[model samples]
Target chain A: EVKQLEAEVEELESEIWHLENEVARLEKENAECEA
Target chain B: KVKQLKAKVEELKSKLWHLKNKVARLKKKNAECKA
Candidate 1:
């Protein structure tokens, strides 16, 4: 059986990680953009 | 992967969700706490 496999959860976790990294990267960019 | 395997990923997503919400909530709480 493929079982109760849910790709959504894994994708969501990955999305969140990506979002966090993006947020951090943006923050860094904003810091540099300040000047 | 059986029940042990099923339960493993269960806690992982939930743990991530829990940590995610906790982080957001704690940030709010900390802001209020500081105020």
Candidate 2:
């Protein structure tokens, strides 16, 4: 029920966070190359 | 209840697919920068 939704949401947030970090790292690398 | 969860799962899976594609593109671009 509500608990299940909470669990799903939590997992989604974690995965999104991981993706954001990877994107940030990639952007930083790209910046360094141009700088 | 099951049907609702199924829809949510599908949505999340689609989001994951989009994120994966974005990461792949970033990786490709990064390689090009190095070359």
Candidate 3:
């Protein structure tokens, strides 16, 4: 259904946001550790 | 409409998959560096 698909897209986007933040956080920490 | 929304979800999921992989890799590197 369109409604379900709409929700799915929203949730997927939210997950993407969270994952990107994790990447950025880990990247910063890793860089700090290496330096 | 449903098909287009479905494809939208597909693209979103694909972007999410790539982001998750990047986060996973960064996490491992961060963990590796800590020790």
The numbered model that scores best in DockQ is: 3
Residue range with the least summed lDDT across 10 consecutive positions in model 2 chain B: B1-10
Model 3 chain B is weakest, by summed lDDT over 10 consecutive residues, at: B20-29
Put down candidate 2 lDDT per residue, B1-35, tens digits, no spaces: 76777687678867877887888888888899899
- Between candidates 1 and 2, name the one with more favorable TM-score: 2
Give the alpha carbon lDDT tens digit for every residue of A1-35 in model 2: 76787588678767977987898898888888867
Stretches > 4 Å off in candidate 3 = none
Q: Given candidate 3, what's the lDDT at residue A2?
A: 78
Score each candidate by Cα lDDT.
0.58, 0.80, 0.89
True contacts kept of each: 0.00, 0.30, 0.96
The TM-score obtained by model 1 is: 0.40
Q: Between candidates 1 and 3, name the one with more favorable lDDT.
A: 3
lDDT of candidate 2 at residue A7, scale 0 to 100? 80
Query: For residues A1-35, what per-residue lDDT tens digits would candidate 3 score against the true structure?
Result: 77788999999999888888888888899999999
Clashing pairs in 2: none
Indicate the DockQ of the complex predicted as candidate 1: 0.07
The CAPRI category of model 2 is: acceptable
RMSD in angstroms, all models? Answer: 6.1, 2.9, 1.2
Docking verdict class for candidate 1: incorrect
Fnat measured on candidate 2? 0.30
